[PDB]
Design a protein around this nucleic acid. Structure first.
Ligand SMILES: Nc1ncnc2c1ncn2[C@@H]1O[C@H](COP(=O)(O)CP(=O)(O)OP(=O)(O)O)[C@@H](O)[C@H]1O
Ligand SMILES: [Mg+2]
Length: 443
RNA sequence: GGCCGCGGCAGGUUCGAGUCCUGCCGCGCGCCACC
């Protein structure tokens, strides 16, 4: 359990076994075979072309390079055409930039179209940097392949690996750049401890400077932030892990933790013990790609959260879950119930024109003077968070994100109490409430 | 699809809204995710 003895045992988890590598090379051999027959200009990129892919996470990426003059429509129609021709079984589901996800001799293959650029300054597609990424990295990353795998494994084990909106973490390319800049996994951990939200890491200049935000400058484009989608919270979650790790190294930092089945009874006691209002918004999952869904669940969850605050229900945290058929928006509030009366502010006693208008309004109770101005008692239209959210989600469905809001329009329901705990949201609830010992890394 | 802006224009809430909530339109090949 010394710092180096643990990195040894951890390499056994992040390094692909030779049986998997062989499967990769065989699929690569057949992939090159089919591509050459089509006479298309291509290149192998990604974690496979640099031998930095994690054990069990084998995926081959193949870029097809087309002329610059090609329309975005022409890039798509030709890219997919080649893709489908090369893959055994394929599947086309993307958010913006078209590509073909499929299989070849049993390995994951992605056939991505892009523009054959010279100098990637003002890229035309979103992925035009990826070939230049590989050209820059192949010569510098050599020998350090396992140092990347330790970092990728360290992050993946703590659920902050991936730049996708489902994660808002560290892209696989960002990890490689960090190894080139620090030299080893251990040197990234040591230094990361003293990162701040202002940290700038310009790899191309071998410099660390201060800035407006966290910013890892892309060697290929000095305007591009490689860590653009890394949330501030996930940045923090990473820094915290590094301080903990150096303070007390362990193999558990590389073991993937998984949720535990919590009894609906134990959960009922925890919420009762807290005396909070725990409820969820349930609706049909819109049939869209994850990268459109999660930004919208974030928005919807926030709009309702903000609503609960200004309505004085004092919300603690928000959360959401996406099962296969349904989406859930969870909320916890300190106020299970509020009074119906509240005090609305009136005008100062001086200017009677406004006061006369104010006191003319028919109210159930008599208004009063306080510290020099008039006040009135008025009634709330709802007295619980559940009743409030029912109203907001009903009327303001449209502001909760395009697809989520339209799905909430057609149907939603507020689930509370024991009926909630029987829903696929236990894991999310335990995280939200800070429930202890609802996780394990047992194999 | 989400996000950040420069503008706006109306509508709602209110004694009172450039200031809180909402809708619509313009313009930055604006940024990010899908590799
Ligand atoms: N969000 C992002 N930011 C910067 N570059 C990205 C990126 N997503 C993809 N890329 C580029 O596309 C290449 C491969 O992308 P992916 O296959 O999706 C992850 P990877 O690099 O293969 O690591 P991984 O297989 O361990 O997940 C990367 O080398 C990178 O150059
Ligand atoms: Mg890959």
């Amino acid at each position: 359990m010394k710092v180096e003895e643990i990195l040894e045992k951890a390499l056994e988890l992040v390094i692909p076994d030779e049986e998997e590598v062989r499967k990769g090379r065989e699929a690569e051999e057949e992939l090159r075979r089919r591509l050459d027959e089509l006479g298309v200009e291509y290149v192998f990129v990604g974690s496979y072309a640099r031998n930095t892919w994690l054990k069990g996470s084998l995926e081959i990426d193949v870029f097809l390079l087309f002329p610059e003059e090609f329309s975005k429509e022409e890039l798509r129609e030709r890219g997919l055409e080649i893709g489908k021709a090369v893959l055994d079984s394929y599947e086309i589901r993307y958010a913006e930039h078209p590509y073909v996800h499929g299989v070849v001799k049993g390995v994951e293959v992605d056939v991505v179209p892009c523009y054959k650029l010279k100098e990637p300054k003002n890229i035309k597609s979103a992925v035009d940097r990826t070939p230049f990424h590989h050209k820059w990295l192949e010569g510098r990353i050599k020998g350090k392949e396992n140092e990347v795998r330790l970092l990728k494994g360290f992050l993946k084990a703590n659920g902050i690996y991936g730049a996708e909106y489902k994660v808002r973490g560290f892209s696989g390319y960002l990890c490689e750049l960090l190894i080139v800049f620090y030299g080893s996994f251990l040197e990234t951990v040591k230094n990361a401890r003293r990162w701040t939200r202002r940290t700038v890491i310009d790899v191309a200049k071998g410099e660390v400077r201060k800035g407006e935000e966290f910013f890892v400058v892309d060697p290929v484009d000095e305007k591009r932030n490689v860590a653009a989608n890394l949330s501030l919270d996930n940045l923090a979650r990473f820094v915290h892990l590094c301080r903990e790790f150096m303070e007390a190294p362990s193999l558990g930092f590389f073991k993937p933790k998984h949720p535990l089945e919590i009894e609906p009874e134990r959960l009922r006691k925890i919420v009762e013990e807290r005396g909070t209002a725990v409820f969820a918004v349930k609706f049909r999952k819109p049939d869209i790609v994850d990268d459109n869904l999660y930004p919208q669940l974030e928005r919807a969850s926030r709009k309702i959260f903000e609503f609960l605050e200004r309505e004085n229900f004092m919300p603690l945290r928000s959360a959401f879950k996406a099962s296969e058929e349904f989406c859930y928006l969870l909320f916890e509030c300190q106020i299970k119930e509020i009074s119906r009366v509240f005090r609305r502010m009136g005008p100062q006693f001086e200017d009677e024109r406004n006061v006369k208008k104010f006191l003319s309004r028919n109210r159930a109770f008599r208004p009063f003077i306080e510290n020099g101005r008039w006040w009135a008692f008025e009634m709330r239209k709802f007295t619980t968070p559940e009743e409030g959210v029912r109203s907001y989600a009903s009327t303001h469905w449209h502001t909760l994100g395009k697809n989520v809001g339209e799905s909430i329009r057609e149907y939603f329901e507020i689930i509370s109490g024991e009926k909630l705990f029987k829903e696929p949201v236990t894991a999310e609830l335990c995280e939200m409430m800070g429930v202890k010992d609802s996780n394990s890394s047992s194999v």
